[model samples]
Structure formats: structure tokens, C-alpha cells
Target: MAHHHHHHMGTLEAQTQGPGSMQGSMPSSSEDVTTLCYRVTGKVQGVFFRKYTKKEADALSLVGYVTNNEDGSVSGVVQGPKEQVDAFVKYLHKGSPKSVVKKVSIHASSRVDADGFEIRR
Candidate 1:
């Protein structure tokens, strides 16, 4: 008798089926599961930055708050899926149309509180 071996190759669907039938059917590991702190500089204050910041966060379903720093800058905390947070980080650079964005700073944390985006005094 001759020795033989058989191997089974399964599709990606078969592999993730244990997780979900298809993408979005199950929560993605990257789903908004983080808190991000952001700072923006250069003509950021008094330019509706916080307003637009909240707008962007709300649109992305992120929960956090944006505030004007005392040092003539704008800062905020954004919490949500990492993917959307990353997108929001990029969005911070643009801010409001009236904003003269110069630089954008980002930080990450494990803190979460707000259930929705808002502006802080």
C-alpha cells in the first residue's frame, strides 16, 4: 500500500464564518474602541473649530468633546472606533473653513466618558 496525504483549503469566508457570515455582520476588531486626544494650532481659536470638530465627530459617530485651549489653540478628545478616529485625526488638520490650520497634534488614551460629541467651554 502507498501512503498519501490530503489537505483541505478553505475560503476566507469559511475562516471568518466562526466570527460572522460576512464583513459588518460581526463587530470589527478595529471598531471604535479607543480614545484620541487632539490639538490644533495656527489660527484655530474663534474660527468655529470646535463647532466643526463636533460636526465631524458626530458624523463619524465618535463620542468626545472639543475645546479651545487657553494658549490660542484648540484641543479635543475623540473616542470611537480606531478607524474613524484615524479619519477624524486627518479631519482635524482641515477643521473649519474659517480656520487657518497650521499644525495638528494627536494623542491616544483609554479614557471614555461622553456618549456623543460636544463643545466644551
Candidate 2:
């Protein structure tokens, strides 16, 4: 009888799924979790800047107030979704047609008290 050796080869079961799902849903609630403060300079006063600012904020569903400073500038705070706040910033920079926006300053706050956009004297 000749000696015979038997070798067992285990089959590789590489059942690997696709790398990853690669899709993530946008986060809700957090988008509107922040408050922003903004100021505009250069020809903002006596040009209906406050009115337009309130208009834009209201349209974006933001709650804040805009007022004219003694230095002939506009100041305000906005609280809403980040996206909406961003849009409002753009409007601030452009301002009303009668108004000229030379500069725009932005800040953020943790708290804001306003049920609607208002024009404060």
C-alpha cells in the first residue's frame, strides 16, 4: 500500500458588502439652533434700511429687530435657521435700493428675544 497525503483547502467566503452607504441625511433642529447679530455701515440711515431689513427677515421667517444707530448705521440681530440667516445677511449687504452698503458686520448670540422682526428707533 502506497502512503497518500490528503490536504484540505478551505474556500474563502469574502462576502464583503459595498464600501459604505455614503449617504447622510441633513441634520434638523440644529440648523436653526443659532442666533446671529449683524451690523451694516455706509449709507444705511435715512434710506429705508430698517424697513427692508425687517422685510427680508420676515420673509426668511427670522425673528429679530433692526434699528438705526446714532452713527448712521444699521444694527440688528437675527434668530432662525442657518440657511435663512445666511440669506438675510446677503440682503443686509445689498440693503435697500436707496441704501448703499459699504460693509457688513456679523456676530452670533446664544439668546434672542423677539417674536417677529421689528424696526426699532
Candidate 3:
């Protein structure tokens, strides 16, 4: 029997800001603390998803962790600047080039204490 797999490419819509601005401008409260929990699906296992997630999170100065669930999905928790947190959400959807992320479920929550990003077992 041949196994079938699903692949998806996510896209974000552009939006206009005030007189002079770009789409999805930074959150009004840049310093505001924010946290997010993301559940990612599709070929997320055995593809270095956790490593890539850590890299992305670190680049944004986010503090949290990413791990793979036994059910073949990836989960991540991130907390940091509101604007960067929002941008990080976008990156989670694409993941590494080796992954074929089909869907991502994100939940925003109160900021928690985290020193740095890590790949959890």
C-alpha cells in the first residue's frame, strides 16, 4: 500500500495602516508582554521542526520551548514582546523547508516566565 501525504502552503493577507505604513504593522503596545501556544500539524516530525522553531524564537528574542508530541504533531509555547510574538506566529506556519505543515492552531495567553527558547524532549 502506498501512503498519502498532504501538503499546504500558508499565506498572509496584506493590510494598510495609517497615512504611511505597511501591512500588519507592529502591535500598538510594543512593550506589552504576550504569550502563545501553537499546535502544528502535517509532516512536522523527523524534520528538525523543534530546532528550527528554537532558532526562529531566539531571533525574535522570544522565550519558550518547542516539542514533538507522541501523536506526530509539534507544539510550541512562546512569550515575549507583543509585536514580535505576532510575527513569530507567521513563522511557525512555514517551519523548516523540509516540513510540510498543513495546519497550525495558535492560542494567545498571559505572559509566563521563560528565560530562553529551547527544544524539549
Candidate 4:
């Protein structure tokens, strides 16, 4: 078997084209690099939508913030795995049992560092 590896600061940086797949191209940390933002409307404000979002986000171990809009809407960013974020987007559609969702507007966003999700004031 022919293999080559480089030692960086006493850490092995595995060869990309040698043995490892694109997984090596991605960050090795469990922290996700994908993040998403959304703006929700229709009965989202008074119906505890923000709190519900936090529940899903927290359950999914996502890190971001949900905030209330002055126009009686909900807006926030969720950062986590693409799969988890997509699932959360579906959650956004269904919302809480008390929520009456009209249109969940997905927004352009990026990955963020967060200790946990929150309802930002």
C-alpha cells in the first residue's frame, strides 16, 4: 500500500487524493457549516411561533436566533446540518399546534457560532 501524509503541528493532515474522500475537504468538527434564515408571516406573531421555532431548533441542536417583527411576523436564522435545517424548514411550515402559518419565507443566510438557539429581543 502506497500512502502519504503530512504532519502539521504534530497532527496528521490526511491526503485528499490518496485515501480520503471529500469528507476530508469538509471541516472535521461536528459543528455544521450550513445555516439558513427565514421570515414567516400569517398568524405567526400572536400564536407563539417564535417559541415553537426555538423548541424545534433546540431539539435539532441548532444554534441561532428567532425574533419578532414589528409588522407582526417572525424572522430568524437557524444554523446546523443541511438535513437538519431542511427538516426544521418543514417544522416552520407546520409550526406549533397553536400556530396558523400562512407563508414561510426562506431567506438567504450563512453559518453562525451560537451556544444555543434563542428568542432574541
Give the TM-scores of the predictions, in the order they appear: 0.62, 0.64, 0.63, 0.62
Candidates' C-alpha lDDT: 0.64, 0.65, 0.65, 0.64
Model 2 C-alpha lDDT per residue in residues 48-121, reported as the tens digit of each score: 44455555665666766677677766777877777877887877767777777778898867657754444455
Instruction: Please provide, for model 4 over 1-121, each residue's C-alpha lDDT reduced to its tens digit, 9 standing for 90 to 100.
Output: 9999987565667873322111112232565567778777767444544455665665666666677667766777877777877888888888666768778898776665553344444
Of 1 and 2, the candidate ranking higher by lDDT: 2
lDDT of 1 by residue, 72-114 (tens): 6677777777787787887876677767877888886666565
Q: Mark the regions of model 4 whose C-alpha exceeds 4 Å error after superposition.
A: 1-32, 49-51, 115-121
* Model 2: residues with Cα > 4 Å off, grouped in runs: 1-31, 115-121
Q: Which stretches of candidate 3 lie over 4 Å from their true place?
A: 1-31, 115-121
Write candidate 3's Cα lDDT for 36-72 as tens digits: 8877776744554455566566566777656767766
lDDT of 2: 0.65
Query: How many Å off is the CA of 15 in candidate 1?
Result: 53
